[PDB]
Ligand binder design. Sequence first.
Ligand SMILES: C[C@@H]1CCO[C@H]2Cn3cc(C(=O)NCc4ccc(F)cc4F)c(=O)c(O)c3C(=O)N12
Ligand SMILES: C[C@@H]1CCO[C@H]2Cn3cc(C(=O)NCc4ccc(F)cc4F)c(=O)c(O)c3C(=O)N12
Ligand SMILES: [Mg+2]
Ligand SMILES: [Mg+2]
Ligand SMILES: [Mg+2]
Ligand SMILES: [Mg+2]
Ligand SMILES: [Zn+2]
Ligand SMILES: [Zn+2]
Lengths: 65, 65, 47, 47, 260, 260, 242, 242
Amino acid sequence: ELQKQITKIQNFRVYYRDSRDPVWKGPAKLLWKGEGAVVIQDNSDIKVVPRRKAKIIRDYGKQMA
Amino acid sequence: ELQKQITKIQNFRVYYRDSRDPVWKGPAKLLWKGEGAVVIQDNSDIKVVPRRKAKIIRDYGKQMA
Amino acid sequence: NFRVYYRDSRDPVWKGPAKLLWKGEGAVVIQDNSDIKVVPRRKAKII
Amino acid sequence: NFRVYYRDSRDPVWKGPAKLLWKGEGAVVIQDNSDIKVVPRRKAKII
Amino acid sequence: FLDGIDKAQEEHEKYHSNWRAMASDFNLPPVVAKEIVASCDKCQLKGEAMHGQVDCSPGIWQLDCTHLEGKVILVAVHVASGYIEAEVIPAETGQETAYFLLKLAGRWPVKTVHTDNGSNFTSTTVKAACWWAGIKQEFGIPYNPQSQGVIESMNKELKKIIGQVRDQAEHLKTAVQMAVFIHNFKRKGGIGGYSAGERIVDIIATDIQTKELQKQITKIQNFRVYYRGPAKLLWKGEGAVVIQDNSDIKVVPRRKAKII
Amino acid sequence: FLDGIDKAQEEHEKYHSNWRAMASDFNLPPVVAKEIVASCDKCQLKGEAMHGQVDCSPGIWQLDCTHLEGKVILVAVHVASGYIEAEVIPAETGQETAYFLLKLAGRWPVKTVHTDNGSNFTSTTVKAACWWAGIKQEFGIPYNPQSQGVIESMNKELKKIIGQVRDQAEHLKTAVQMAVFIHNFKRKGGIGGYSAGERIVDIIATDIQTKELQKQITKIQNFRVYYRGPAKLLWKGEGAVVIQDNSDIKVVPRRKAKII
Amino acid sequence: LDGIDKAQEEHEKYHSNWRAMASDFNLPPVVAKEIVASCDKCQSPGIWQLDCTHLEGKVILVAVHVASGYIEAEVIPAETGQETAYFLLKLAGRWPVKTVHTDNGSNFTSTTVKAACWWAGIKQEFGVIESMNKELKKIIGQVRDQAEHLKTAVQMAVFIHNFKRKGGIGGYSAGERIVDIIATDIQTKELQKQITKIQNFRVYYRWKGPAKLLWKGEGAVVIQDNSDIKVVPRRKAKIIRD
Amino acid sequence: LDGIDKAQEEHEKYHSNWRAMASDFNLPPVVAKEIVASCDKCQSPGIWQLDCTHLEGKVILVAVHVASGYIEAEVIPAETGQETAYFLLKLAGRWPVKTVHTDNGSNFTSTTVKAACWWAGIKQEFGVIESMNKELKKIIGQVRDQAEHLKTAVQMAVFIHNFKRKGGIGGYSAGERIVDIIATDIQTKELQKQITKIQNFRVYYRWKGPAKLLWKGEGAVVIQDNSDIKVVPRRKAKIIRD
DNA sequence: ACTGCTAGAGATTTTCCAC
DNA sequence: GTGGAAAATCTCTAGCA
DNA sequence: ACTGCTAGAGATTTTCCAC
DNA sequence: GTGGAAAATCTCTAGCA
Ligand SMILES: C[C@@H]1CCO[C@H]2Cn3cc(C(=O)NCc4ccc(F)cc4F)c(=O)c(O)c3C(=O)N12
Ligand SMILES: C[C@@H]1CCO[C@H]2Cn3cc(C(=O)NCc4ccc(F)cc4F)c(=O)c(O)c3C(=O)N12
Ligand SMILES: [Mg+2]
Ligand SMILES: [Mg+2]
Ligand SMILES: [Mg+2]
Ligand SMILES: [Mg+2]
Ligand SMILES: [Zn+2]
Ligand SMILES: [Zn+2]
């Protein structure tokens, strides 16, 4: 069930930000969570966002629908 | 000389603004000056800007170029 | 009919509702108990 | 070498030039006459 | 449903939950929750996120009194150009401001002075001085400094300059005059790459020039236009005609426009 | 030309004319004019028009003391969510703040406390309380309130709510608790359409869940990647692979990537 | 689409809940809920318990989350209605209190506490409590020397009991358990909200008789006519709100 | 293009300046300036004059713009170097003073006034003045009864003299004339700036001999070789900086 | 070596509802 | 594929000492 | 019935120089 | 049509009581 656990970790939403943009970017897909950085995928674009700029949730309103 | 005084009136530049945009619009071409409004032409678009939002100049750095 | 909730001057507390008499660009003229006031629209909410 | 002109805290008068010791996102660590300070980049200018 | 509006009102009476909270919790449309919120007086604690725009006519001047080193500096700015006249006055009195304004009217065509409601701008002496020189007096909304957004800005900029030339002047009046000189004639930029002095010269010269040219064209280019009422022609060109229609300027393509 | 820059230097020493004025008047490139300006200390009076971003980690709390009706309210906000714990304290003392923080650590997993340098926050009692509970103490740059933006914002918001419920609580502590309750559970919006309490539950639950899942995957999915040193595989798919390269996470297309 | 039969048979032979089906067979939670609710043979997180513990002439109000063992303990000046109402208001503000169990005491049945429960929405009602209180006693005794005051000792004990103490089914602390339980409660609330949102819609397929809408998907509409959960192409089924 | 020969011919037969030849024929003003700068037979705005006029025991410093009749009049406490330096600093700040004429008086030759002229850039030097001062005196005599102090009377007289006395070539007030004159000066300065900017460029056409550049345009490059202004397509002429 | 944000009010843009 | 109300998104501001 | 702006500092984008 | 420095444009902030 390694694939299923991978899917579970990809079921989260990561609202992140860049260095100069103040607005919170959209809900990317959490590919990997690490101590200092989180690897996400926003519209087929793999990014490494620092932990101090990432909000990882699992939107239950969007999950239970 | 009525076809060249028109050119003289159109040799001016009208930096204007809208009712919600704070930044000054570019140098339109002054087609007509009136007591309460100025009719200008910015990129083939005839507009009637109020006098309280228009800076009409005759930029000399450009005229003498 | 319009209800205007306004912050007239140096008073954090809001007031209203007040009848709206005139609406311009950045200034609303309102009547609150026969007192006419001019409020910048940054300090007036119209309903 | 970098020259940093900074407004440290509650002092409208600007200071410097000081020596830049570290540059980050929104904070510069600078050395003015052996005095180490941290300044938000809104209040520091680097040359 | 409509019986859930009662529970939404009852929860709003205590908690004043925002429209989204009521819509989510009580299963209501956004319109109904927003209407319930809009019916409460205590939840109306915010204006509209906007900023008006000040009058930029060529003949409007904005005046204000600043304080530096315990000295009053009366500052006037040409809104259309950014050209500042400043003077250190002994005390913030109505007579000093009236003298400043009378000086100003004789050196540049002041057609209107925009000021805050300070005790020295609403005085009767300033009123009489304005009456004499034919100046319209505008007062900003009380305690609304943004209305004077231009001159106040200069109070910053001017002050900045005074902080660079202070060591070259032994008194504040000399430093103030130096700062006015530097801002007007040595600090370029702005709309035309000008400095404030050249910008004001350009604005006024263009005003007179356009006035006389337009008077000529009106004296000669006379027409009556019928479109789609006998309005008056302004500018016919590129197949589009501008017509003043009882103070309602309308731009219409060449079709459905007859210049008689 | 190069002998026409001494005149620019002199006019700058006198008037500090900006680079554009020097370039226009003395016919200089913008580069040399800007160099002349950049060589003067007096003309370095502006920073960079930027705003950094505060730390939004799941375990960081921002604290501050506000004053209302002559009473001190100690307010803590979860930066990641927006969930506030507030309490009216008798006087602004280090021991009161230490007790507040000790309560906070026992009810939510505080891993870092961000505060202004106020006498209460920098005390030794708060330091000992943080040491006991293993909290990292972060202090903003002195007189830089923007560093604490979040909590400062909350104050405003919090105070707003009080002004709506202050007629339902006879004392300020009850109104403060009501405002905290309303903000946490009756004011939704934000990122997920949540309220602050739901948001914090979600953030914490997701942190624990993803930690568990990642530990499981690491225990299982063991690989070494030899692209183009022996990095550690993180995520492979969609024609790309993410690899930790000695603490330098790099993403590379499937080509030139060997997962051994 | 093409995943319902396995879940239905799995539930028939194991009477399993709806999260299991919605996570193992990848269906929208609403349809799994309908599957579990269609069989009659196959048909809490917000309740706290309040108590007073008297130590060193000081009364400690302890609120225990019975589902998790999560303790909120604080010393209060006296067993007065005002102090207990303040504690209840704080408890409501921090965590979602729905019902509170007391001991019918004099301080738990005052008009002030009654109105505090009424305002916060709490609903008053008159072996986890005893065990958790005893655990607080033990931990306070362990960490009473580290502080000079009983309030600080109580807060240290609460911190240790909630977090430093790891015991349970999987070696979990009370904080993690309460976070998980409240997350599940939020999930249930979202499910019920969406079910109530869609329940006002009737779908006609192919007309045939009306139907109950279970999922208006992007490219597949799942409805149910007479306990028959069937998916359809969007070009077959038409809805009307009633 | 087209109308350059017309410009040169009109000039030789009428020795007209460059503004006329560049407004009646639509040329780049640099090219017209070059045209007038080719024949020897065809080869001020910042001039101010100070004076002190004494009325009622008060000295009024009057600065007259010689080209316009524009007066700046201020009653000053005394004929000291400080007061005249202040007046000069104000005058420089408001209008572009280049050189200044005085009467070699004790107040106009002090180290303070010298340093004020040096700082502001003014250059000291020792029938418009008399007529304009008499006009100011007459208008002050007219409007003295309209104010109490003499400073107010001086300012009223200055306002009337500058803006309400319409007498001249076409009924123009002094303010209009000074605005026009300063505008013309700015125009001249811009033209000289452009000329000095291009004068470092050498252009080769078709090579042939070098050339002096007069205008680079979107698709027309106007240059000149041996007093011969000719236009060339950009695909024919190459520039360099030297 | 550390750092502006938040919540609300209008306006603009998709988007689904019905053919 | 076409319009209309509605919901989402984006822009922008007051106030936090 | 009246109204935020200015000037500077980086960053991004065109644009002309040379093939 | 192609790259590289350079100039223009755009975005954004402190301070004005
Ligand atoms: C006693 C008079 C009459 C009644 O009003 C007061 C108070 N006041 C306040 C500011 C002021 O708030 N300046 C800061 C500022 C902030 C924002 C902005 F957009 C512009 C700004 F100038 C003034 O400048 C000012 O001149 C006055 C003033 O003169 N008065
Ligand atoms: C004596 C302590 C220690 C030293 O610093 C002072 C002064 N101070 C000032 C503000 C303040 O300026 N608030 C308004 C504000 C303005 C802009 C913004 F982004 C955030 C904002 F909060 C505070 O909030 C605050 O807490 C303090 C404080 O506590 N202290
Ligand atoms: Mg003022
Ligand atoms: Mg002011
Ligand atoms: Mg503080
Ligand atoms: Mg604070
Ligand atoms: Zn309300
Ligand atoms: Zn300088």
